[PDB]
Each structure stands twice: as structure tokens, then as C-alpha cells.
Amino acid sequence: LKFLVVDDGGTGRRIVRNLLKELGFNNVEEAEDGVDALNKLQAGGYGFVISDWNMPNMDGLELLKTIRADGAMSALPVLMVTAEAKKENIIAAAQAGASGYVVKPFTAATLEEKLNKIFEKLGM
Ligand SMILES: [Mg+2]
To answer: Residues lining ligand 1 (ion), CB within 5 A?
Structure first.
């Protein structure tokens, strides 16, 4: 399953890249903003998207909205990473169609769980 990790911060991508590797997922690509992510997703082949919220050029919510509006990309599982205490962001993400969310900072256990929920939910 090919994952696309989107985050404008290198540390954030490295944290997610290592946790996935630990969980056994070695097919992981990275993008630094919503535009960079869409350029890659349009190329095809992806099976899961993990996206940061605040990013320049195109943020995570706009990215999610774009994915969901696109016929070829609309069915992609999208896990949004929201900041601690930004309750409105979780609500806006759910309304926009996020498959789930995870609040940063998160542990490896929390991340595995959120992933497990989506897999079960979408039946993967
Ligand atoms: Mg960011």
C-alpha cells in the first residue's frame, strides 16, 4: 500500500516515515505542501494520505477538499494531523470528508490505532 506523507516540516515527515516503517510499511513517499502532494497523487498509485494542517501554497484542508472533489482521487483514505487543542479543525476536517484525524503530538500507539480504525472502517 503506497502512502503519501504531507508536511511542510522535515521533522514531522521523518516522525511519520519512521512509525510507518516500524509498522511494516516500506512504500512511503513524501510531499511538502498541498500542491506537491496533488502533483504526486495525480501520477496515480497511492493508497493512503497522511496530511499536516498548516502548510504554505495549499494547506491540508484545501488539499482534502481538492482530493474529495476529484473523481479519481475521491475514494482515498485521508488521515488529517491536527494541532493540540484546535477542536474546530477536527470538525471542519470531518465535514470535509477526512477518513480520520490524529492530534499532534501523537505516539506510535495512537497512530497505529487511527490507522487501524480507517482500515476497518473502509474495509481494507
Ligand atoms: Mg505544517
So the answer is: 8, 52, 54-55
Distance (angstroms) between ligand 1 centre and the Cα of 54 equals 4
Q: Which among 15, 19, 41, 12 has a CA at the least distance from the CA of 29?
A: 41
Q: How was this structure determined?
A: X-ray
| Ligand 1 midpoint to CA 60 (Å) | 9
Cell numbers 487511527 correspond to what residue? Answer: 114
Contact (Cβ atoms closer than 8 angstroms) between residue 57 and residue 38: no
* Euclidean distance between CA atoms 63 and 83, whole angstroms: 17
**Which amino acid does the sequence have at 49?**
V
Cell of residue 71, nine digits: 473523481
CATH of domain 1-124: 3.40.50.2300
How far apart are the CA of 84 and the centre of ligand 1, in A? Answer: 13
Q: Measured in angstroms, how far is the CA atom of residue 32 from the centroid of ligand 1? A: 9
* Model resolution, angstroms: 1.9
